[PDB]
Design a protein around this ligand. Sequence first.
Ligand SMILES: [Mg+2]
Ligand SMILES: [Zn+2]
Ligand SMILES: [Zn+2]
Lengths: 79, 1343, 49, 98
Amino acid sequence: ARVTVQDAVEKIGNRFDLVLVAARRARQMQVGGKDPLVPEENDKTTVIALREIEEGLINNQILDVRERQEQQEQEAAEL
Amino acid sequence: EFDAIKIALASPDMIRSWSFGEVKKPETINYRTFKPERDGLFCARIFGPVKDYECLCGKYKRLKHRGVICEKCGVEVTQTKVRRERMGHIELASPTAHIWFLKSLPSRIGLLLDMPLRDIERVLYFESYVVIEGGMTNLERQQILTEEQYLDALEEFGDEFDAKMGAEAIQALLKSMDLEQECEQLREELNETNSETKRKKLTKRIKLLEAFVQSGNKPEWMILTVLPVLPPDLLNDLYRRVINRNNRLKRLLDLAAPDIIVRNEKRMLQEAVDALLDNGRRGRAITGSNKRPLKSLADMIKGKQGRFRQNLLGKRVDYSGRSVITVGPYLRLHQCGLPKKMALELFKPFIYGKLELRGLATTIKAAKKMVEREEAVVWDILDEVIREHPVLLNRAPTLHRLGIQAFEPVLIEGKAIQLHPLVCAAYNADFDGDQMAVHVPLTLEAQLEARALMMSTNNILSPANGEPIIVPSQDVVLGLYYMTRDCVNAKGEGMVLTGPKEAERLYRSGLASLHARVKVRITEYEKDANGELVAKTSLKDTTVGRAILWMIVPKGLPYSIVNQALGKKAISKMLNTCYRILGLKPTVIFADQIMYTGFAYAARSGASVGIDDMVIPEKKHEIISEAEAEVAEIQEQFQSGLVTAGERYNKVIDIWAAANDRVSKAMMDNLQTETVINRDGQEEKQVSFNSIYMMADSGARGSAAQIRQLAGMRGLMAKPDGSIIETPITANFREGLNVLQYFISTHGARKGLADTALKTANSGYLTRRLVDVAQDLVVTEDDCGTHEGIMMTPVIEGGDVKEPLRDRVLGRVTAEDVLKPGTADILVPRNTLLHEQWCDLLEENSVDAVKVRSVVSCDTDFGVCAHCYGRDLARGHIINKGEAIGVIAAQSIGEPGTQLTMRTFHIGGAASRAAAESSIQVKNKGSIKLSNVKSVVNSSGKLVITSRNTELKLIDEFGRTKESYKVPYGAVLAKGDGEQVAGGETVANWDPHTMPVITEVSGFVRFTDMIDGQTITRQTDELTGLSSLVVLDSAERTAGGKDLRPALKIVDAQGNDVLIPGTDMPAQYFLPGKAIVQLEDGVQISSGDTLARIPQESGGTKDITGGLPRVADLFEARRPKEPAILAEISGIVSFGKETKGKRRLVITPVDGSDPYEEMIPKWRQLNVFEGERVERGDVISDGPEAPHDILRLRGVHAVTRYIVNEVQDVYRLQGVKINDKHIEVIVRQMLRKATIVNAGSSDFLEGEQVEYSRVKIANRELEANGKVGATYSRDLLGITKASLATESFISAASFQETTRVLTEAAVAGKRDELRGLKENVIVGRLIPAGTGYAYHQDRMRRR
Amino acid sequence: RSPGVFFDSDKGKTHSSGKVLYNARIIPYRGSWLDFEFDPKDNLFVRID
Amino acid sequence: HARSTGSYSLVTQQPLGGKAQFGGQRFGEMEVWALEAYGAAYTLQEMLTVKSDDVNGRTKMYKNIVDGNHQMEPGMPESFNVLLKEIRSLGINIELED
RNA sequence: CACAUUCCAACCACACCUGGCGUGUGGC
DNA sequence: GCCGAGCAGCTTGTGAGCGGA
DNA sequence: TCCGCTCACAATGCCACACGCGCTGCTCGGCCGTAT
Ligand SMILES: [Mg+2]
Ligand SMILES: [Zn+2]
Ligand SMILES: [Zn+2]
């Protein structure tokens, strides 16, 4: 149950890229099957995405470097 | 995945090779058989197999024979979807060009090959076909002939003279036409010709042909060398008839038929292709059955039946519920209620997925059975699936952004949708039976978006104004007003407490009353300079209700905000301060708790109005008797023969108005008083405790006029003519209204009801227009990086302060750095965002005007930058890039149109219009500034004004102007320049009945260049006696006096020509036609006094400013009836030949000849004389103006300033607050097109209305060079025309005039970047405005 | 409208002339209408259906 | 009146109205403009084509939803291809880009 | 010799009819 | 002369005249 | 001979009617349905 996201607007430049990176994170988490890093409350993926965006441990650049390193390590394991 | 679309002619060979397979067989379908018709209309090699991975014959269905066709079928085993996407060709018999290229206004075939429309038609149609390959003949290579001349020339030229007809004729003509030579010839002819009509025709022709020869087009490419066939899923029988005619030709042409037979055959095939192109534009009206024609690629693509307009923009959507609303007061603000059945039905696949994810239901059938059975176990699944899945509430009429909002649903009973009370005011949805809809995002991205942007908590500031749209409604504010309204004597009078919890205990225990002044202890938190809150304890002396309310407000706000009566304005400003100081996060919960406490205490209050709750004034009957006695005395005076009907009518009207005002004031005074209570004394009269006063004064639901009509007399009612009847309603609602009283009441009320209905039915059209005119822009660039702007000042025109500075500038970035009155002070530097503290600094610095940014000053092409737009108006920060500010602007403009009365009585000159009362009066004291200073001390020591554009402003005790007043044309002012005169008195005067000719210097005057009986007559005055000479006009004069223009030569005391100080030219006062001369020649004319009262009309009034059609015309920029004409060129004005139907006039400046000619109707007078060398752009005829001349003669900032001022005047007359950014961007979109006035070294000429940003980016390349770029001139036009003149054809095609605009678009041949919004809705692509915009940029980084 | 004759006046700023025009309309119970109308000029004109 | 997923008209592959049957609610142009005033490019695309236009998209979307895949298919409409081809077959080149 | 299109133990394939709408003509 | 189908009995703007000196 | 001025559409725009989406007999115009 998320009621206020004003601090998220304070964190990211605007709401467009905010909801874009939130959608990418939710796609990589829910239909991606990966693991989160924030304690949940038996909820959906949207509100935990908003929570981990509000904290600051996940953003555009962090998602970019994470997916890049994942692709690199997958290519390395592929040999 | 698409870039800007474009539409033109290109590569018919690739158009051919794009599809495969022939359909020459004229037979429709071999329905009797079931083998693949290799050439039939419903073939396979053109489209595909009948079904997916199945042959057409039905003899093979597996995936083993796939790879080779059958023995005699030819079906390649594949998917059937390609049938909906693959095409072929109808085998042709004669290459046709077009028929739809003829009625395009003008034709698109003749106007490209120097041939008239009728000639091209009679070539393609059997009237007179063209001769080609003449031979030794003396005919031109591209000259058309007729049948008779082709026959008589066939004798002198037997076989060398030939001719073709229709399709192949036009094919050979366009093939043998080398347009580049024709284009060069046309350009040379244009450079040689000198005319107007031929010039315009030839420049349109040369532009239309240059745009074709520059693009990848060709003349022969216009010929439909190959005609593709339409798949069966989508005209079918039409091209069946076409191929039937083709087969008839091939069976009647391959036999070497005579030329006439093959001519008829190819012309019939041409007519068939013309049928294919259009059914009605060719000249034939086919029918399908019982006089029912069929279509040709379209019938009417407009309205609610077309494709590109209706079904690709508006249609039905599934997963949408619709129900009624009801007040849910217990639910939180962010959430809303939802019925059990609605949530169960609108989420059946969500329930299916949640059940299949677990072991409750594996297969889909069992899951559906369990869901439809509605077991008690599935309820937890439905509860979990809606725990964090918000939905969208939608009101049926959506005018602004908040028409659709996001809410977290909670499951409840009843088929009604519970709604939060604090949001219905934003929805404009009362609970009288309003039905609303609910939608589901259905997508993870869509769910995240709805939770992020359209969330209820994320939308509290109105998109129009920064004020909170979540303002409390009547119930909560009434409860709070009752709670904080302190009395004089109650339980616990003057006791002492130590905490608000003690007050709550005392109240809920029944020991002390609710409202009673007591000493309590409050621990408040003052906001530190940083993000901290310093705590301080203080013993306040306030009522118990305020201490109760203190438990709800957060620690940030001080105690002084709650120490009031808490009216509607008070609680709204309290919420505003809470949002401004504490941000957005705690404001939501604060408002929720405020509503909770308001409801609770309004319930515990017991507010109710009864019969004895509206006291009737005792002196009301006395006042009414005195008023009726006075009007009876006035009527007897009129009947005695002392006054006329008009003045006695006005007297009765004002007497009744004064009596109504007095009785209403008496009632209002009697309401508050008489509530005397004993608080340890005898008499302690205070604010009344009456219920109706608590409901009215609190501003909750009742207003002053309503309670006035309820308690006191109703007032004055009028007929639809607006004339107030002489019989006022002398009763009130508490008493019984007489029959005639209620009759007049409903007579006046039905008009208002019908006006409201018609206006709420009409506002949708204007809203749609305002949406479509300014929807093609999005905020793309961050900062355009410019220096231009507009000068903003507090609106002081007329009254003291109509609109202050702060509210007009807060919300943007100053274009130029604001300079404090102290020199070299940059406390507000360039490119700075504004805040409440910032505007506070601007006000304390006594800043008069500020150069603020604007959307027009943003030089970014195809879009506006966020840095020069302003704030968000919904989030308290700088606006970002991407959002469609144009759409929100159109919404915020068209939303409050529901408060615009069309025309009830507002005409502008309702009370009176006279220029005798033009004496200027003022209130404040300070400096006096004068613009257009022409003030001369006359021989009588007074000060006379010798100008019209002179305006008198009052600079205050700090430096700012507060009052502005216009002086009439040649007025008299007792004051002067810089005279520190007090306020409260009139110091001017003027004559409305005429226009004096007051002088500036002394001396004599004589009838120089005058004569009686030729241009002047002999008339005497019937009031004084002296003869009043009448200078004739162009109407009542003969031929011998047409060449004479009399005047008055001002001379000195001796009688010689005056020597004007400053110049060397004498100044005589010219007397135009129809003039009155009273002070005749040879008299001592005192300086600064009326001499010749030239007549002029002073009773014209047609103002409709207080009406919606006024705003409609302002947005359309339509020409008014009598436009206020302006002077095109400066200098002197010379009158020449007249009576050419009307009067004519010439103007010539000092730095040029007189190429400007104008005409003036004889019923419109002039403003200035001939001897006045006036400046261009000055007023000539008083009245309504036209924005075209304003823009083209005063600049860009002046016209938009006038437009914004007028629309703000209208909206403040209707009591509507609207920020100026929306009207700014609208007026900016209005003049998106401009015209060239000097070709220069560019590639275009002055006869081409080129878009402003396009001609600007054309200058971007010439900026590096020394060649002059262009000479643009902005010319605003109708928003309907500006929308039709859109660079994008996709947005234009679906717009109105679908037939015209579709023709003009699909025959243009141009490129459109679809850098807008409507095209994306057409194709269905993601709009480049919201979350997709950056996404688009996300796919624009690499490529 | 009761079958008979009526007299209408085009008042206001109609026809962009500032002059009220006058037209008499005759309408039967069932049949062909009739109108005698004025103009900015002093020429009276007739209209049928 | 609420409708999850039902029949479609014969001439139009779009949902029907009427409370007496299994019908949805009409999406008028005013709410189009209201939604365009906000962001919600994805949400608008869903409301327009995935929910009403793409006959294979809504089925594929339902299939993705019932197995937990809460991801939309872009699914460029077939009718867009139909109109593009009619424009090309009109004798006017479909000068699309990107 | 050659293409090859097969008479098809649990069970995936054999699921649904319908509304209000539309055509043409005329009007400014 | 033989078969198949339609028809009946029942407000903003512009191109093109039309005067208009 | 170009320039005002206005009318017939062209088409925002809706509206009205005839009817058809599931009448039948008559009268004028064009008729050869697997290695068809
Ligand atoms: Mg209502
Ligand atoms: Zn086969
Ligand atoms: Zn800018």
